[PDB]
Subunit: 326 residues, 2 copies
């Protein structure tokens, strides 16, 4: 299991659900014994590691092939270049920690693909604030990704390119949100769904047509909401310090809640954390309702993969050095 | 007509005709009167401007859309510098315009812009041979619009650029003193960016030819590739030799090969290559006579004629370029 640098929780409050989450039990069982779809993961209870774990998910799963992902990300970094080292170390650390936690089902080859893809996204995201050589590097990445999976790879790469196009567009500084639900709809747009959905299909080694995705859409919206709001909660402090120095806008659910509810910032964080707890229960309810419907094994595996992204995202954020001690 | 900074001839002997050439007559008629396929080009006698014109070709054609190409090449350079000594950039913009406007004179205003950007991408890579997603987008945006401008010709045009990039990588590290001139000619022909130049002719001439359409013109194509490459050798020799004395750089040039094989002076080797080039032009004219007797598609005939315009354009560009001079 990958070493943990730091652990933090912005809010500081943990909880326990009124009723057992049978639907999440597979994560807990995976810690002790092999469970379907988790053969490639180390599954652990973060509380045993000392990491604050204020969530309904009983465990977090991490791909056991993170060491390969580090080599892959480092290899790609050497091609691209062909306190700066400190920035590079953070880039490589984030490029591994995020996909290894969010998409833990990854085997060794697909983990390498995920880490390279994560590096490319994170390098572009940092940049926001000879072309043929550079175009060749990406083309080699597409070839290796396409070879590992002929079916999902093209969507996987298209998901990367769709994300770069969204980054270009900027929400207006003037624009404000009247309702939290309105903020959620905007914030959901920030998530790279096409990549993350393909990344689940890739790491879980399953294929779903877009029509197979229509039944899972309510769970999918729940997973995007939980992922996005979790990212806002853990990143809030990093944004405010950036706001003070560079005058950064702070587009964060915490700030929206503070304005809409007219409460303290500390209370806004508590409300967001609780909103996330209710989302986790809503995710659990949808899973129960979905089990009633005749679902395909791949559809169910995707439904479960979305749950693993949410839990892994919490673990990634809680152990992330950018967010802790900003 | 595009301003010329410099004019030079490495050898200095002029051509004198014993037999007038009917096939090359269309270039001459184009100066005084509009000729089919030259509606987009200014056709001139380079001697009238004061440029030395040591060739059987009666005229050179240069696109009337060069100013647009300068606009396009300047735009592409600005995107590239943003996504990332000044003397190299300005020279690069100059070579990126002068070469395609002279080599592919038929280009209209939109296709002239395409050629200048494509040429800029090729030249910058060649200098290099001597974040990533943002660079990739720049090429993808170039690839789009090229395909929109010409949906049929666009794919091989862009593929021709990529095929060249790979070939540059597949380049022998050193070439042994050539035992044979025919052997040297074959190696030079292999380097020729054939896929791109054939597509650039199709693009600029606004005609399309299948591979089967190209089978009749193959002897002319080989002559054109040879004349193009040997012309480049002749005019670049002074550039290569002076560099070779300063850096002990290897020289791979027809001038040096003949001087070695005939054991002759440099002045005589240059005269020998100049005459070999005139004999190639005579063979080009002879093949043009033979082709006319054979039934030929009008597009095929436009391609045969486009190859001649590349040869004459290359001569004018080579004499015009400052780097070949000084």
């Amino acid at each position: 299991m990958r070493p943990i640098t730091c652990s933090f929780d912005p809010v500081g409050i943990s909880f326990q659900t009124e009723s057992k989450q049978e639907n999440f039990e597979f994560l807990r069982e995976a810690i002790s014994r092999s469970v379907p779809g988790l053969e490639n993961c180390n599954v652990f209870d973060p509380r045993s590691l000392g990491v604050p774990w204020p969530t309904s998910f009983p465990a977090a799963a991490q791909s056991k092939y993170w060491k390969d992902a580090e080599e892959a990300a480092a290899e790609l970094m050497d091609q691209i270049v062909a306190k700066k080292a400190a920035k590079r170390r953070e880039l490589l650390d984030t490029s591994v920690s995020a996909p290894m936690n969010m998409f833990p089902a990854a085997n060794a080859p697909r983990a390498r693909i995920m880490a390279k893809a994560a590096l490319l996204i994170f390098m572009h995201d940092d940049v926001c604030e000879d072309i043929l050589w550079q175009n060749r590097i990406f083309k080699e990445f597409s070839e290796e990704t396409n070879r590992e999976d002929p079916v999902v790879g093209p969507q996987f790469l298209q998901g990367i390119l769709n994300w770069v196009e969204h980054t270009r567009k900027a929400l207006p500084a003037s624009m404000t949100f009247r309702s939290f639900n309105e903020y959620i709809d905007y914030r959901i747009g920030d998530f790279a769904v096409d990549f993350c959905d393909a990344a689940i299909l890739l790491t879980c080694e399953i294929f779903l047509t877009p029509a197979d995705m229509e039944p899972l859409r309510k769970l999918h919206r729940l997973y995007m909401t939980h992922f996005s709001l979790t990212n806002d909660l853990y990143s809030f402090n990093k944004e405010v310090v950036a706001e003070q120095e560079t005058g950064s806008a702070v587009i964060n659910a915490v700030r929206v809640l503070e304005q809409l509810v007219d409460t303290s910032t500390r209370s806004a964080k508590v409300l967001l954390r609780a909103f996330l707890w209710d989302l986790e229960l809503q995710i659990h309810d949808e899973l129960t309702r979905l089990k009633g419907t005749d679902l395909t094994p791949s559809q169910w595996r995707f439904a479960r993969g979305m749950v693993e992204v949410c839990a892994g995202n919490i673990f990634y954020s809680a152990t992330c050095l950018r967010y802790a001690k900003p």
